[PDB]
């Protein structure tokens, strides 16, 4: 057997930041909407929409980004809501932007993020999305099963 959801957590507030010159903004959405399809029909909950839109930004901007989108997506919620989850695409090969993203919205933000790499994001294949669905699942507080 593969690994499955035992629990589906919840992520009813996302947002969508991209740092790859290779996914124009429709791609992005695309990618983020199949995604979000996975993790509902695995088992989660969780809002095909995003809080804002997909924005597109330099690797060198990434701590201003960031923090920008955070308070702009945080602000359009219902009062004492919070963001659940950010989704990251990355290029493939992106130096110290990966632990810079990671250091800013584990100790700065306070927000889950799951990162995915252009080469996958233009692939979207099924197995790719399963896998993710997972491991965003046991981030948000959900239980995976083990093999």
Known sequence: SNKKMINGGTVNNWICINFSRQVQDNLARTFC?????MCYVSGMAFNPEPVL?????????????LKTRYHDATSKLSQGKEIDLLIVILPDNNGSLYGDLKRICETELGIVSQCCLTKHVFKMSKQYMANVALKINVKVGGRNTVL
């Not at 909407?33 to 399809?37: D, I, K, T, V, W």
């Not at 997909?54 to 060198?60: F, N």
């Open 53 to 65: 839109p997909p924005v597109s930004a330099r690797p060198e901007q990434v701590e201003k980004v």
């Open 33 to 37: 909407q199949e995604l979000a399809q």
